[PDB]
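Tutorial, part two.
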Amino acid sequence: GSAQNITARIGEPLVLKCKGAPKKPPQRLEWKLNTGRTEAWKVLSPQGGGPWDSVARVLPNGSLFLPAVGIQDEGIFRCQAMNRNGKETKSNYRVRVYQIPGKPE
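Running the prediction step on this input gives:
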């Protein structure tokens, strides 16, 4: 549970897990995803019901499911959770699509 390498293809579905939120129900938590070069980063929420067809939705267990990750969606995924103890759980998952930009940021 720390910077996991995940390979994917443009238009292919991909799922991510957030170290902290078990099979439990959809509780309080924040979701963030960084893609593109720098101006493509978007904030994901536990309420993806609807726009899922446009982007993706968040699982009830605190996970992330994508219907089709595009080349623009390529980048790094970051998730955060909060336990009853007061401590927060961090989770970073690296995602790579088929086609690449070429030059790094």
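Residues 1-105 form a domain with the Immunoglobulin-like fold (CATH 2.60.40.10). In part three we will examine how such features are distributed along the chain.
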